[PDB]
Structure 1
Amino acid sequence: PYSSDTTPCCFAYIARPLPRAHIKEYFYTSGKCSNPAVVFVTRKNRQVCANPEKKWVREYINSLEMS
């Protein structure tokens, strides 16, 4: 019933923590996707899928939220 634009989903999670200093932004993928995910945006503007349940991921989010 709703948006007919594509939206990004994640089908795998990066296995090891990204360097924190290379990440500038994050977002969660749509709740419509089959998997929950954090996407980190790097300073080279790459987008990397990550597991929201991982400690390092939650730590990075808190840090990013902690401007």
Structure 2
Amino acid sequence: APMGSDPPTACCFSYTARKLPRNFVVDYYETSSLCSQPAVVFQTKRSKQVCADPSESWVQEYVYDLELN
């Protein structure tokens, strides 16, 4: 059926500059795909969501910890 048209896309334009302490990341969220530059988004406690360069190994590590417990 006629699906949506072509809305924008929540793509990160940059990233923070400090690794969020595990005590500051209760969850996370990934970007879209349309834009050729997706990224991982960490959800904290006194903020909302923070973009993170997947190129930083610590980002992949925190994601793994979130996949576990």
Fold shared per TM-score above 0.5: yes
Structure 1 unaligned blocks of 5 or more: none
* Structure-2-length-normalised TM-score: 0.79
Q: Give the length in aligned residue pairs.
A: 67
1:33-52 equivalences under 5 Å are 33-52=35-54
Q: 1:25 corresponds to which letter in structure 2? A: D
Partner of 1:12: 14
* Structure-1-length-normalised TM-score: 0.80
| Segments of 4+ moved more than 3 angstroms | 1-7
Which structure has greater strand proportion? 1
- Say which one has the larger Rg: 2
Using the aligned pairs only, state the percent identity: 49
The answer to whether the 8 Å contact 1:52/1:58 transfers is: yes
Aligned-pair CA distance for 1:28: 1.1
CA–CA separation in structure 1 for the residues paired with 2:26 and 2:52? 15
Q: 2:67 corresponds to which letter in structure 1? A: E
CA–CA separation in structure 2 for the residues paired with 1:51 and 1:12? 8
Change (3 A) 1:48 1:32: same
The answer to whether the 8 Å contact 1:36/1:51 transfers is: no
SS at match of 1:14: coil
